[PDB]
Design a protein around this ligand. Structure first.
Ligand SMILES: CNCCCCc1c(-c2cc(C)cc(C)c2)cnc2ccc(-c3cncc(O)c3)cc12
Length: 283
């Protein structure tokens, strides 16, 4: 795919001079996102070492040219005009799954029905990336965007890798609270995306963030051991901000999350198996 090359000044004009006040959108993928209106459509404009930051910008565009799917955010264009690089996307009115699970800014809690659809859509997006020999490397709820219908859209391909076993790297990247043991040691494999997706499934079931410094356990992945040692059950961790969650489908989602979170990469299910299991949960 070939994208529209936007003018930096057109992007600066439509985003009100890249205003940092709320409604700015968010920040994380080594850049800040801003709202704007261009060519009769609402858009999201990402304003991004200087050389390492350009590699993140080129990688997003390369992966986006090759990867187009109902469950991946669509890139509309970009801006190279100067040295303050901008990426232009289709605007996702419902934000991230992280913000929606936390009910940030007073939004209503997501229902179990909406959560199951989001889990399936996110898994369909990761399946498409793996089928096309791509490793995301930063699967997390902040990187799952939600559109006008709450359809899951995988975002942020700056750290993504092609594969077109297992390779190793010297610059270990990702989000600690979601990373597989092998990814924290420098391995690059699609099995690490499965593990991180298992952490996303625990956030969906519980509504709790992957890490919370004022909590025990501080890391959400540790509830897997508390449940396996029969100290607690998944029912003690279910998000109470839902009225439509039945124990059978919650346990079926938890079983997928548990399998995803296997400490040995070769014992985890592949994305096609995760996708099959999530489809059978609803059906
Ligand atoms: C605190 N918000 C964090 C998530 C929001 C980020 C965000 C929102 C959004 C923003 C706010 C403030 C509120 C709502 C409801 C939607 C809307 N559209 C987006 C489109 C693309 C990317 C993107 C960014 N980087 C890389 C991509 O591939 C896509 C991010 C987007």
């Amino acid at each position: 795919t070939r994208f529209h090359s936007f003018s930096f000044y057109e992007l600066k004009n439509v985003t009100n001079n890249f205003d940092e006040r709320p409604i700015k959108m968010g920040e994380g993928g080594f850049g800040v996102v801003y709202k704007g209106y261009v060519n009769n459509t609402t858009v999201a404009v990402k304003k991004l070492t200087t050389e390492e930051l350009k590699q993140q910008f080129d990688q997003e565009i390369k992966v986006m040219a090759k990867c187009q799917h109902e469950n991946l955010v669509e890139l509309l264009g970009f801006s190279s005009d100067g040295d303050d690089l901008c990426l232009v996307y289709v605007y996702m009115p419902n934000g991230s799954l992280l913000d929606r699970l936390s009910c940030l800014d007073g939004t209503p809690p997501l229902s179990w029905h909406m959560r199951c659809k989001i889990a399936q859509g996110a898994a369909n997006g990761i399946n498409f990336l793996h089928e096309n020999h791509h490793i995301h490397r930063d699967i997390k709820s902040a990187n799952i965007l939600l559109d006008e219908a709450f359809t899951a859209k995988i975002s942020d391909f700056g750290l993504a890798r092609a594969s077109e076993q297992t390779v190793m790297t010297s610059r270990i990247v990702g989000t600690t609270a979601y990373m597989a043991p092998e990814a924290l040691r420098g391995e690059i494999t699609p099995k690490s995306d499965i593990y991180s997706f298992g952490v996303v499934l625990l956030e969906i079931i519980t509504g709790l963030p992957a890490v919370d410094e004022h909590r025990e356990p501080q890391l959400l992945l540790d509830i897997k051991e508390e449940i396996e040692d029969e100290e607690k059950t998944i029912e003690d961790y279910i998000d109470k901000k839902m009225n439509d969650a039945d124990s059978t489908s919650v346990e079926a989602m938890y079983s997928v999350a548990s399998q995803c979170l296997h400490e040995k990469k070769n014992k985890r299910p592949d994305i096609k198996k995760v996708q099959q299991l999530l489809q059978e949960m609803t059906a």
